[PDB]
């Protein structure tokens, strides 16, 4: 029911990881020391690294280990660095501003520093990955990076496409977020040394959790008040990016089709369309879809024996589903 109450079980490892990341990036460089401190914040932002640590401890308890190997820590760092670099470069791309205000580092430090820092993080992650010394995990992570790049390139060609399927949206969202979390859980299980079927189960867990997160984010984009963010709701809708509620609503109203195809030329077509979507009930169907994904994830977690990290993962699912309130 609260982020900190969830993460407190693995807080010390996260503290160590933040310290290591700080010391790693911008060693002795002043402007990059300040950027480094700002970029990783302090604790928190832990969903992906905390997930890594939780799955690590659960599978290690199953496999009778006594403590986390250093490879698990390296893996957590790799995941964190990749996600941070992705966010930074995404900010510089499509030139939008004030992500949750939090003047993006592109505004705070400028384009040069942002591009340089993104490159530095990518390079360090590659070096650590090569040091891991397990060719299969390397293949997985490389696949993830390539899919992210391809998805970025492809999203430009699908703007305002007035007919797209649920599968296409799911696969785009998979390339956007789910692949990283799925690969992380599977790699953690591999480093813990458990059976193969359990690794497949963990992969499915990661997939479905990532999908749930992404869908819930799209839903929040519609209902949130403009002050809780910058641009008022339906920003990406105006930009030409269709979301799940839009797809569900498009199966009912042609007027929405003409408004979209009009490239929102007529005045107040934006608010008209938002009210249309609210009236069509696409939000309820998106809610149900998110619930199905979460249910699949919970059932997948039934392979691990009783524990407290299990309850932590299930409560993570509940907190995700409850963020919509």
């Amino acid at each position: 029911m609260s982020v900190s109450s969830l993460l407190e079980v693995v807080a010390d490892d996260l503290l160590k990881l933040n310290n290591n990341l700080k010391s790693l990036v911008g060693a002795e460089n002043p402007v990059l020391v300040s950027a480094a401190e700002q970029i990783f914040g302090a604790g928190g932002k832990r969903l992906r690294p905390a997930l890594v640590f939780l799955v690590s401890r659960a599978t290690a308890e199953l496999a009778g280990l006594l403590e986390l190997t250093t490879e698990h820590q390296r893996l957590a760092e790799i995941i964190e660095m990749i996600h941070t670099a992705s966010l930074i470069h995404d900010d510089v791309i499509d030139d939008s501003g004030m992500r949750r205000g939090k003047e993006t580092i592109h505004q705070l430090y400028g384009t040069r520093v942002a591009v340089l820092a993104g490159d530095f993080m990518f390079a360090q992650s590659s070096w650590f990955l090569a040091n891991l010394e397990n060719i299969e995990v390397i293949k997985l992570i490389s696949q993830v990076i390539k899919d992210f790049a391809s998805g970025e390139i492809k999203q430009a060609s699908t703007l305002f496409d007035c007919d797209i399927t649920l599968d296409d949206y799911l696969l785009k969202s998979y390339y956007k977020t789910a692949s990283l979390i799925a690969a992380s859980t599977r790699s953690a299980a591999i480093f813990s040394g458990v059976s193969t079927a359990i690794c497949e189960q963990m992969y499915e867990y990661g997939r479905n959790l990532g999908l749930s997160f992404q869908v819930v984010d799209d839903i929040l984009d519609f209902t949130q008040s403009a002050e809780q963010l910058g641009k008022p709701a339906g920003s990406d809708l105006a930009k030409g990016n269709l979301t799940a509620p839009v797809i569900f609503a498009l199966q009912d109203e042609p007027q929405l089709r003409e408004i979209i195809d009009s490239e929102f030329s007529e005045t107040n077509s934006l608010a008209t369309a938002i009210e249309l979507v609210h009236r069509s009930g696409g939000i309820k169907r998106a809610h149900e879809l998110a619930r199905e994904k979460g249910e699949i994830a919970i059932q997948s977690l039934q392979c691990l024996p009783r524990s407290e990290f299990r309850s932590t993962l299930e409560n993570m699912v509940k907190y995700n589903l409850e963020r919509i309130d």
Binding site: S157, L159, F160, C162, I260, D261, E263, E266
Partner: protein, 197 residues
């Protein structure tokens, strides 16, 4: 008549700042501009356009407004949200050979000197005294780099600016001309010089 004059400059004042009405247009502004052109054609100047093709219609014309609108999916596929811009539209009319040509200039933000030309030559007919008929003759894209880019949707590009069907002519002024087509579209276009073409 000077009422034609202030009508046409009222048109000029209305149409500005809209990019010849090719990238979207609010409902009421569209309403008023087409009501204005209705007013213009109603106060008909020299009628019977076929007798004045060689006289009024002969030559070149640049498009000032039309009901053609690139929107959404097609605009995204052709890459017109960015990286390519439509210079303008010319419709040099060859009454001498009973032909006509539509050239469209494409440019980019100095991406190259591209300044390409899509040329569609068509053959028209004198069928009626106002409603002529015209059919495609041939098409080309120069230079090779622009063709390299557009190779895929060359067909859709032709389909959008397909200059065939019938065309009822109206308001054949010594400066501009109004015309409705088989597609019930509207084209208002003004004289120019073939040199700038």
């Amino acid at each position: 008549e000077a009422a034609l004059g202030d009508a046409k400059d009222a048109l000029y004042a209305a149409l500005e700042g809209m990019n010849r009405g090719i990238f979207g247009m609010t409902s009421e502004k569209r309403s008023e501009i087409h009501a204005l052109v209705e007013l213009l054609e109603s106060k008909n100047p020299t009628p019977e356009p076929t007798d004045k093709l060689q006289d009024k219609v002969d030559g070149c014309w640049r498009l000032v407004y039309s009901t053609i609108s690139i929107l959404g999916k097609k605009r995204t596929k052709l890459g017109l949200r960015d990286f390519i811009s439509l210079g303008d539209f010319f419709q040099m009319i060859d009454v001498k050979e009973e032909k006509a040509v539509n050239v469209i200039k494409f440019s980019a933000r100095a991406l190259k000197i591209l300044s390409g030309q899509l040329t569609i030559e068509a053959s028209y007919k004198i069928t009626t005294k106002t409603k002529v008929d015209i059919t495609l003759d041939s098409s080309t894209i120069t230079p090779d780099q622009l063709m390299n880019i557009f190779q895929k949707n060359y067909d859709m590009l032709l389909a959008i600016f397909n200059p065939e069907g019938w065309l009822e002519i109206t308001y054949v002024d010594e400066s501009l001309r109004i015309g409705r087509d088989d597609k019930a579209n509207i084209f208002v276009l003004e004289r120019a010089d073939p040199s700038e073409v």
